[PDB]
Design an enzyme around this catalytic site. Structure first.
Site, short mmCIF file in Angstrom:
data_model
loop_
_atom_site.label_atom_id
_atom_site.label_comp_id
_atom_site.label_asym_id
_atom_site.label_seq_id
_atom_site.Cartn_x
_atom_site.Cartn_y
_atom_site.Cartn_z
N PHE A 114 0.68 -1.12 0.21
CA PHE A 114 0.15 -0.06 0.10
C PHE A 114 0.68 1.07 -0.02
O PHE A 114 0.56 2.26 -0.65
CB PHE A 114 -0.98 0.16 1.34
CG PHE A 114 -1.98 0.86 1.20
CD1 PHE A 114 -3.20 0.86 0.19
CD2 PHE A 114 -1.82 2.21 1.90
CE1 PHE A 114 -4.29 1.81 0.54
CE2 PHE A 114 -2.76 3.10 1.88
CZ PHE A 114 -3.82 3.00 1.25
N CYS A 121 -4.17 10.42 -3.21
CA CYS A 121 -3.00 10.02 -3.54
C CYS A 121 -2.60 8.58 -2.71
O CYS A 121 -1.55 8.03 -2.98
CB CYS A 121 -1.73 10.84 -3.31
SG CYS A 121 -1.24 11.45 -1.87
N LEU A 170 2.21 1.69 -3.73
CA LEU A 170 1.25 2.25 -4.47
C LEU A 170 1.12 3.62 -4.25
O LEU A 170 0.97 4.42 -5.24
CB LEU A 170 -0.10 1.40 -4.39
CG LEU A 170 -1.27 2.18 -4.82
CD1 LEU A 170 -0.95 1.88 -6.43
CD2 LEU A 170 -2.53 1.77 -4.42
N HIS A 171 1.03 4.03 -3.01
CA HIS A 171 1.10 5.43 -2.68
C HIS A 171 2.23 6.16 -3.17
O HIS A 171 2.06 7.30 -3.84
CB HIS A 171 1.21 5.64 -1.07
CG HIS A 171 1.32 7.25 -0.63
ND1 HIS A 171 0.41 8.13 -1.14
CD2 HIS A 171 2.26 7.82 0.11
CE1 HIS A 171 0.90 9.18 -0.65
NE2 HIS A 171 2.02 8.95 0.29
N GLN A 172 3.44 5.71 -3.28
CA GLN A 172 4.61 6.32 -3.88
C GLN A 172 4.16 6.53 -5.29
O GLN A 172 4.41 7.57 -5.87
CB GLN A 172 5.66 5.49 -3.64
CG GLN A 172 6.48 5.63 -2.01
CD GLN A 172 7.82 4.86 -1.73
OE1 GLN A 172 7.57 3.60 -1.25
NE2 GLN A 172 8.66 5.36 -1.92
#
Length: 157
Positions: free
Chosen positions: A27, A145, A30-32
RNA sequence: CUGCCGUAUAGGCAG
């Protein structure tokens, strides 16, 4: 919908790491990747959600148009992590489905969470996540984001 | 763990 595509990322079992920890890492990357990409039209859901046991479960589903999903996946955001994941195929969602919000909920809650590390601070925090009530159609918002709702709905199936 | 809008640890948000 504009978001009729998805991809399921399954956590492979690892004796050294409980799923909740892989999920937190998944998670985070994915955020990055989303901060990189830049839109607000990629959403997430945790289809193996266990509400009763406040676990997010072994699956992360990513939702997008066929095109946003193409872009996101053409990117080295799982570099270092591929080894711990089993990936489905990007696909058109089934239909009909109900829809729901998946949202961050802030302040020790009865809610699944991922532990993350803020980029600036070395500080670890807990991002708690709620899958909202099922409805029939999708209202017209977008996503953060973190792939979590700032108005937007994801097909739930 | 930190930070922000807000008269308010009403209620919200952002990392």
């Amino acid at each position: 919908f504009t978001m009729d595509h998805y991809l399921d990322i399954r956590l492979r079992p690892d004796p050294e790491f409980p799923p909740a920890q892989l999920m937190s890492v998944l998670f985070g990357k994915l955020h990055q990747a989303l901060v990189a990409q830049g839109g607000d039209r990629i959403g997430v859901s945790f289809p193996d959600l266990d509400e009763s046991r406040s676990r997010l479960g072994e699956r992360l589903r990513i939702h997008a148009s066929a095109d946003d999903l193409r872009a996101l996946l053409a990117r080295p955001w799982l570099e270092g992590l591929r080894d711990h994941l089993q990936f489905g195929e990007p696909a058109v969602v089934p239909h009909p489905t109900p829809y729901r919000q998946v949202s961050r909920v802030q302040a020790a809650l009865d809610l699944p969470f991922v532990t993350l590390r803020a980029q600036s601070t070395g500080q670890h925090f807990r991002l708690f996540i709620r899958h909202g009530p099922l409805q029939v159609t999708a209202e017209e918002g977008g996503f953060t984001c973190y792939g979590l709702s700032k108005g937007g709905f994801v097909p739930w199936f």
